[PDB]
Amino acid sequence: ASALLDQALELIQKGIHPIKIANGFDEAAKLAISKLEETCDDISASNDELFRDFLLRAAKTSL
Amino acid sequence: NFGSQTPTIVVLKEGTDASQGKGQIISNINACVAVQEALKPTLGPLGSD
Q1: Is A24 on the interface with B (CB under 8 A)?
Q2: A19 in reach of chain B (CB within 8 A)
Q3: Least CA distance to A20: which residue of chain B?
């Protein structure tokens, strides 16, 4: 969030209206989510034996 | 006659403001314009908060 505000401060000094800055971030937010959604794959095809492995993978990251 | 002071009677209780003169009704106009100053930039979809 602060990174968006740091790049917005440079655009305000250039004379850009703040609403035009907010309108650009909303359109760019959906383009990033739709791009990452196509890259990921579905792991639900695996059985319960492999499904436990994916739970151990994301656990060690948050720990 | 009850004292050498003999105070002068004031029509209104102490603390009351004044009026008439020149610019009394103008004071009410500048009060609404100053409040309007804050609501002007909030008008329009590109307005601020």
Answers
A1: no
A2: yes
A3: B46
CA dist A1 and A25 (Å) reads: 11
H-assigned helices in chain B? 24-39
DSSP H or E segment with residue A1: none
**Cβ(A44)–Cβ(A52) below 8 Å:** no
CA distance to A45, A51, B45, per residue, from A40 (Å): 14, 16, 37
Q: Tell me how far apart the terminal alpha carbons of chain B are, to the nearest angstrom.
A: 66
Q: Which residue has the tokens 């009704």?
A: B25
Query: What token pair was written down for A43?
Result: 């792991």
Chain A residue closest in CA terms to B46: A19
Record the tokens describing residue A31, joined without a space: 């383009």
Tell me the one-letter amino acid at B2.
F
Do the chains contact at A18 and B45, CB–CB below 8 Å?
no
Q: What is the DSSP letter of A15?
A: T
Q: What is the resolution of this structure in A?
A: 3.6
Give the technique used to solve this structure: cryo-EM
